[PDB]
RNA sequence: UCGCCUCCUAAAAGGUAACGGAGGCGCCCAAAGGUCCCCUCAGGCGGGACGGAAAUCCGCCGGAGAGCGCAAGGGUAGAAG
RNA sequence: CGCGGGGUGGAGCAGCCUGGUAGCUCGUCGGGCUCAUAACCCGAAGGUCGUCGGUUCAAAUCCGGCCCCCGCAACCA
RNA sequence: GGCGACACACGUGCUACAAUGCCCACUACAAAGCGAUGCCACCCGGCAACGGGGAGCUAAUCGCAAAAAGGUGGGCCCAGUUCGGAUUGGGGUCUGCAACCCGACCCCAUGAAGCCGGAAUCGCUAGUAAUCGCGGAUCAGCCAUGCCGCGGUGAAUACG
């Protein structure tokens, strides 16, 4: 690289809602992150949050 | 809407030709005037001829017609833009 | 700090900073501050990064929210459109649905007034 | 405002009671 | 040089890849060369200052400052005089590729609003994969307190895999969320 | 119409006429000049936020159909770009 | 066929020379004042610029042909 | 079924665009008129609408009843906002044989136009105009912001 003009790219430690993210190798060490994904919330470990009327009215 | 626990309401002169078909073995065309009536699970698959004010409209019934009164699907006036 | 989606709120207050979330307001919120046992009248500018991650992961993982919620309302209509439902014809070709008269002001649901010509 | 049904001031106007106008 | 994905590529990506298609030679393996980020900014035509803040931002998230594309030919329908800057574009590879790529998967993508997956049809038929971003503040180095305007980029991912399924495999086992 | 340039007429050297067929010139450039090093096009197909036929990117294919300030002709990437 | 000027919202006229951006009066439409109409007042709409091709990055604008328009001219014989 | 259509045009209105203001707690001060085919105290479930029960009164006896502005304390800090409550999703509740067309109401989410309105133009001279609640008719319910009444606080200004 052209010595001078680049960002410094030191190893970092980064966080998320889960445990720490390890590798991190980044400009500006020690950043926080609202959502990283290895969760088993959020789409990895899938999980949710026609259907209704045949239940509620069925006898009533 | 319809008070829950009081129905739900299907005009029983209509229900009387569907539990007369779905739990019969005969299953074919029907032609009503009762749009005030709620719906299946026991009519879904039949073909009811609904009334608009002027004549009898055909509707096929599916599971996404969850609890819609029978006139939600046979509208009452004509526009066609211009 | 950030909540559902990102939807970063800040200074104002903590109880209102949640109105500014889509899918939440003044009711789905004032409860979820005692669910985390959190004083409302404090400000998202100052509140422990501890008590932030209760809320962040409380609400995202409580119910349908900003993204998945608008996702829900959308295909709820293409359900009513594409189906022939009356309430959904007033969508397929764009008019008021529940009740009111259309010989006068629908100018919210009907777009700005497009004058034409008189007899 | 006299038409915010979700307030005390608007429930008085409409004449109804609720969570925001109890008795 | 120890970067976790560079590690994870060699141990547990290559093996599962060799035994999945069956490779005579060690080089026939799909290898990950030259991911390239391109910020198309017509949004800086008369304002020159929009670019210099954009590039300080993009470098902050790649450890290289980008080079500046300039306008190939002059086109009228949009202002576009024939020499102007219309975007930034950085080629990063070779362990800078990785520390960028690994970061993107952990933090960036899961921070994308509503994220039901990465559409898996962007394979260009000779085994490279490109995708586009909306906002810049999904990366860790972007504070929401330095975004003067929201603007995204296109991302190229070049791969030595002669076909797309091997491109598909190389990237999946690398940890790429598809549909 | 009147001088200069390009093509054809022009009969494969040159030259060749008509109130024959068609176009340009009366400038421009301090870099659009010298040199040394480097680079290679138009176009098409696939891919890619705001990008639409064509702003930018990435892939393959592309021997010159691009470019060479301005008209045409000749020339030209093994460069004159 | 000869020279010259032109063709632009419904009418009439600018804009074209000097490429980027279509304007003025009237009319038309919606609303006012009026018992009512006109006048008057407040808003609005409305066009690819004869046409085809070329030029340029971009064409009402520059270039060629065509087409209509007005004007001038066809003398010695 | 329609009278409830919707490219649009006008009349009478309501609610607003906010800090003399919004919200929440506590706390007061009226009149008229209705109601034993009804008005429902008080208890219980319910966020609530409402539903259970149930006491009283043919009613200066009992009930609709809380009057609201105001008062007190406190929160919001000039922000399309805790202004504003239009539109739409979902969940219910009661009337009624029935609520798609086409009902009222409660709750959760949504928060739209609107930052005092061109030419024009209306009402009002005193307890009036403004602003705030309340009742009644019709009436199952109700599209009431309407109509007829009731009291609360309470201006400005008329040379001519
Ligand atoms: Mg209604
Ligand atoms: Mg209607
Ligand atoms: Mg409000
Ligand atoms: Mg009422
Ligand atoms: Mg009402
Ligand atoms: Mg009452
Ligand atoms: Mg390849
Ligand atoms: Mg010769
Ligand atoms: Mg003579
Ligand atoms: Mg009817
Ligand atoms: Mg009527
Ligand atoms: Mg009204
Ligand atoms: Mg008023
Ligand atoms: Mg009395
Ligand atoms: Mg209770
Ligand atoms: Mg009463
Ligand atoms: Mg203000
Ligand atoms: Mg606005
Ligand atoms: Mg109805
Ligand atoms: Mg008087
Ligand atoms: Mg008021
Ligand atoms: Mg009534
Ligand atoms: Mg009323
Ligand atoms: Mg009333």
UniProtKB/Swiss-Prot annotation, chain B:
Gene3D superfamilies tied to this protein: 30s Ribosomal Protein S19, Chain A
InterPro entries: Ribosomal_uS19, Ribosomal_uS19_bac-type, Ribosomal_uS19_CS, Ribosomal_uS19_SF
Sorted UniProt keywords: Ribonucleoprotein, Ribosomal protein, RNA-binding, rRNA-binding
Annotated GO CC locations: cytoplasm; small ribosomal subunit
Tagged with keyword RNA-binding: yes
Keyword Ribonucleoprotein: yes
Pfam family, one: Ribosomal_S19
Domain of life where this protein originates: Bacteria
GO biological process terms, semicolon-separated: ribosomal small subunit assembly; translation
SUPFAM superfamilies named in the record: Ribosomal protein S19
Molecular-function annotations in GO: rRNA binding; structural constituent of ribosome
Stated role: Located at the top of the head of the 30S subunit, extending towards the 50S subunit, which it may contact in the 70S complex. Contacts several RNA helices of the 16S rRNA.
Similarity-based family: Belongs to the universal ribosomal protein uS19 family.
UniProt cross-references to NCBIfam families, sorted A to Z: rpsS_bact
Quaternary structure and partners: Part of the 30S ribosomal subunit. Forms a loose dimer with protein S13.
HAMAP family the UniProt entry points to: Ribosomal_uS19
Name recorded for this polypeptide: Small ribosomal subunit protein uS19
Organism from which the protein derives: Thermus thermophilus (strain ATCC 27634 / DSM 579 / HB8)
Organism lineage string: Bacteria, Thermotogati, Deinococcota, Deinococci, Thermales
Curated annotation (Swiss-Prot), chain C:
Gene Ontology CC annotations of this record: cytosol; small ribosomal subunit
Keyword Electron transport annotated: no
Keyword Amino-acid biosynthesis: no
A Pfam family recorded for this sequence: Ribosomal_S13
Region (Disordered): 94-119
MF-aspect GO terms: rRNA binding; structural constituent of ribosome; tRNA binding
Keywords carried by this UniProt record: Ribonucleoprotein, Ribosomal protein, RNA-binding, rRNA-binding, tRNA-binding
Any Gene Ontology biological process: translation
Domain of life: Bacteria
UniProt-listed InterPro entries: Rbsml_uS13_C, Ribosomal_uS13, Ribosomal_uS13-like_H2TH, Ribosomal_uS13_bac-type, Ribosomal_uS13_CS
Protein purpose: Located at the top of the head of the 30S subunit, it contacts several helices of the 16S rRNA. In the 70S ribosome structure it contacts the 23S rRNA (bridge B1a) and protein L5 of the 50S subunit (bridge B1b), connecting the top of the two subunits; these bridges are in contact with the A site and P site tRNAs respectively and are implicated in movement during ribosome translocation. Separately contacts the tRNAs in the A and P sites.
NCBIfam families assigned to the protein according to its UniProt record, in alphabetical order: uS13_bact
Family assignment from sequence similarity: Belongs to the universal ribosomal protein uS13 family.
Subunit structure: Part of the 30S ribosomal subunit. Forms a loose heterodimer with protein S19. Forms two bridges to the 50S subunit in the 70S ribosome, contacting protein L5 and the 23S rRNA; these bridges are straddled by the 5S rRNA.
Protein name: Small ribosomal subunit protein uS13
Organism of derivation: Thermus thermophilus (strain ATCC 27634 / DSM 579 / HB8)
Lineage, opening ranks: Bacteria, Thermotogati, Deinococcota, Deinococci, Thermales
From Swiss-Prot, chain D:
GO molecular function: rRNA binding
GO cellular component: ribonucleoprotein complex; ribosome
InterPro entries, sorted: Ribosomal_bTHX, Ribosomal_bTHX/bTHXc/bTHXm
Top-level taxon in the UniProt lineage: Bacteria
Keyword annotations: Ribonucleoprotein, Ribosomal protein, RNA-binding, rRNA-binding
Residue spans of biased composition, Basic residues class: 1-12
Region Disordered, residue ranges: 1-23
Function: Binds at the top of the head of the 30S subunit. It stabilizes a number of different RNA elements and thus is important for subunit structure.
Family designation: Belongs to the bacterial ribosomal protein bTHX family.
Oligomer status and interactors: Part of the 30S ribosomal subunit.
Protein's name according to its UniProt entry: Small ribosomal subunit protein bTHX
Gene that this polypeptide is encoded by: rpsU
UniProtKB/Swiss-Prot annotation, chain E:
Keyword Ribosomal protein attached: yes
Superkingdom as given in the UniProt entry: Bacteria
Pfam families according to UniProt: Ribosomal_L5, Ribosomal_L5_C
Keywords assigned: Ribonucleoprotein, Ribosomal protein, RNA-binding, rRNA-binding, tRNA-binding
CC terms in the record's Gene Ontology section: ribonucleoprotein complex; ribosome
GO MF entry, a single one: tRNA binding
Entry annotated with the keyword Kinase: no
Coiled-coil residues: none
Example GO biological process: translation
Sequence similarity: Belongs to the universal ribosomal protein uL5 family.
NCBIfam families per the UniProt record, alphabetical: PRK00010.1 (NF000585)
Quaternary organization: Part of the 50S ribosomal subunit; part of the 5S rRNA/uL5/uL18/bL25 (TL7) subcomplex; has also been isolated as a complex with 5S rRNA, bL25 (TL7) and DNA binding protein II. Forms a bridge to the 30S subunit in the 70S ribosome, contacting protein uS13; this bridge is straddled by the 5S rRNA. Contacts the P site tRNA.
Function: This is one of the proteins that bind and probably mediate the attachment of the 5S RNA into the large ribosomal subunit, where it forms part of the central protuberance. In the 70S ribosome it contacts protein S13 of the 30S subunit (forming bridge B1b) connecting the head of the 30S subunit to the top of the 50S subunit. The bridge itself contacts the P site tRNA and is implicated in movement during ribosome translocation.
Protein name, per record: Large ribosomal subunit protein uL5
Organism: Thermus thermophilus (strain ATCC 27634 / DSM 579 / HB8)
Lineage of producing organism: Bacteria, Thermotogati, Deinococcota, Deinococci, Thermales
């Amino acid at each position: 690289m052209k010595e001078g003009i680049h960002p410094k790219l030191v190893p970092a430690r980064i966080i998320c809602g889960c445990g720490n993210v390890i590798e991190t190798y980044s400009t500006k060490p020690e950043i926080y992150v609202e959502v990283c994904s290895k969760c088993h919330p959020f789409y990895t470990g899938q999980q949710r949050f026609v259907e209704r009327f045949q239940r509620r009215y069925g006898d009533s | 809407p319809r008070s829950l626990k009081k129905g739900v309401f299907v005009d029983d002169h209509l229900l009387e030709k569907v539990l007369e078909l779905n739990a019969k073995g005969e299953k074919r065309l029907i032609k009503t005037w009762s749009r005030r009536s709620t719906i299946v699970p026991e009519m879904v698959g039949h073909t009811i001829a609904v009334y608009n004010g002027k004549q009898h409209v055909p509707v096929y019934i599916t599971e996404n017609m969850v609890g819609h009164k029978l006139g939600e699907f046979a509208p009452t006036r004509t526009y066609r833009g211009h | 700090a950030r909540i559902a989606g990102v939807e970063i709120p800040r200074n104002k207050r903590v109880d209102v900073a949640l109105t500014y979330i889509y899918g939440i307001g003044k009711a789905r919120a004032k409860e979820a501050l005692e669910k985390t046992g959190i004083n409302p009248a404090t400000r998202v500018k100052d509140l422990t990064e501890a008590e932030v991650v209760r809320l962040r992961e409380y609400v995202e993982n409580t119910w349908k929210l900003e993204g998945e919620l608008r996702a829900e309302v959308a295909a709820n209509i293409k359900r009513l459109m594409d189906i022939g439902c009356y309430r959904g014809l007033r969508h397929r070709r764009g008019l008021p649905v529940r009740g009111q008269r259309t010989r006068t002001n629908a100018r919210t649901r009907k777009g700005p007034r497009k004058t034409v010509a008189g007899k | 405002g006299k038409g915010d049904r979700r307030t005390r001031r608007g429930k008085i106007w409409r004449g109804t009671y609720g969570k925001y106008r109890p008795r | 040089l120890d970067v976790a994905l560079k590690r994870k590529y060699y141990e547990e990506v290559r093996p599962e890849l060799i035994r999945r298609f069956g490779y005579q030679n060690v080089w026939e393996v799909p290898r990950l060369e030259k991911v390239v980020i391109n910020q198309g900014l017509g949004e800086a035509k008369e304002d020159a200052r929009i670019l210099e803040k954009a590039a300080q931002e993009l470098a902050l998230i790649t450890g290289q400052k980008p080079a500046v594309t300039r306008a190939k030919k002059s086109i009228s329908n949009f202002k576009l005089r024939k020499g102007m800057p219309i975007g930034l574009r950085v080629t990063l590879r070779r362990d800078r590729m990785w520390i960028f790529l690994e970061k993107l998967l952990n933090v960036a993508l899961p921070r994308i609003r509503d994220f039901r997956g990465l559409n898996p049809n962007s394979f260009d038929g000779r085994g490279n994969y490109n995708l586009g971003l909306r906002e810049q503040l999904i990366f860790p180095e972007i504070t929401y307190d330095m975004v003067d305007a929201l603007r995204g980029m296109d991302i190229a991912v070049v791969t030595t895999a002669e076909t797309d399924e091997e491109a598909r495999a190389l990237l999946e086992l690398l940890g790429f969320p598809f549909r």
